[PDB]
Design a protein around this ligand. Structure first.
Ligand code: HEC
Length: 251
């Protein structure tokens, strides 16, 4: 979630341009962003973002069942640019934005906006009202062509802040050996326990949460780190970059 990024990463964009959501949402899925080529100072403009995905395909949920996907994003604007205050956003734009609550990454980074999680069904496309700065009043900005960075996220991640894998990723054999048993946990918690007999006779038990499907069978020999399941992840994170020119009013 955006909060996972906020609580664990001071800056959402790394030196090489990678946005931190990618450290946990391990699958790539394209996104799109559009902003006007240019904007006058102290003016409200729209950033239209696209987070496409097949809405017919459900994902594995935290509870092990299948369900809809939720989305979120992080938008990195040039210093000085900020979310347009409600009083500056015309009715026609507020309607396009819908019931979304964009928030600054931190009180000290009002130029970085986030949103989510929100339903993918309704927000696979979003509009963000942005207010441009004024070089005449802000010396941290000038009349330049500035870059804008975007990260669009869909679906549950593969690893948590604590480093533990979620049930929405691949599970691998902890050791090489012969699978001597594949036990179904319960019927309410789901999941499995895969017993692997090593060459020395020791038996290790790999626990697999409900969600992923097994691709191995009893009696089958596996190598260390060999996948025991499929890759249930159907979501993805994508990045895009664009630009905008802050116009210099002439009179
Ligand atoms: C790892 C420390 C993470 C970072 C950094 C980010 N996300 Fe994440 N996200 C992560 C997990 C493991 C989960 C699943 C939680 C669960 O058990 O359900 C999520 C989930 C989301 C969601 C909800 C998706 C859904 O329910 O279908 C969204 C919209 C999402 N994450 C967005 C998001 C964005 C935009 C991030 C970067 C700014 C981001 N996440 C970082 C793990 C982590």
């Amino acid at each position: 979630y955006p909060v996972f990024a906020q609580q664990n990463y001071a800056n959402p964009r790394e030196a090489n341009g990678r946005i931190v959501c990618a450290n946990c949402h391990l699958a790539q899925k394209a996104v799109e962003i559009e902003v006007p080529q240019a904007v006058l100072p102290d003016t409200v403009f729209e950033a239209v973002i696209e987070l496409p995905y097949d809405k017919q395909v459900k994902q594995v949920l935290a509870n092990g069942k299948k369900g809809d996907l939720n989305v979120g994003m992080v938008l990195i604007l040039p210093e000085g640019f900020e979310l347009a205050p409600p009083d500056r956003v015309p009715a026609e734009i507020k309607e396009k934005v819908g019931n979304l609550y964009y928030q600054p990454y931190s009180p000290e980074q009002k130029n970085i906006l986030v949103v989510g999680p929100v339903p993918g069904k309704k927000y696979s496309e979003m509009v963000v009202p942005i207010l441009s700065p004024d070089p005449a009043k802000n010396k941290n900005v000038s009349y330049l062509k500035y870059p804008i960075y975007f990260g669009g996220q869909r679906g549950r991640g593969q690893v948590y802040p604590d480093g533990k894998k979620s049930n929405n990723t691949i599970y691998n054999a902890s050791a090489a050996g012969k699978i001597v048993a594949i036990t179904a946990l319960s019927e309410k918690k789901g999941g499995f326990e895969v017993s692997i007999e090593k060459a020395n006779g020791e038996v290790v038990v790999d626990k697999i949460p409900a969600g992923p499907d097994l691709i191995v069978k009893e009696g089958q020999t596996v190598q260390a780190d060999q996948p025991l399941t499929n890759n249930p992840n159907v979501g993805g994170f994508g990045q895009a970059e664009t630009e905008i020119v802050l116009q210099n009013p002439a009179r």
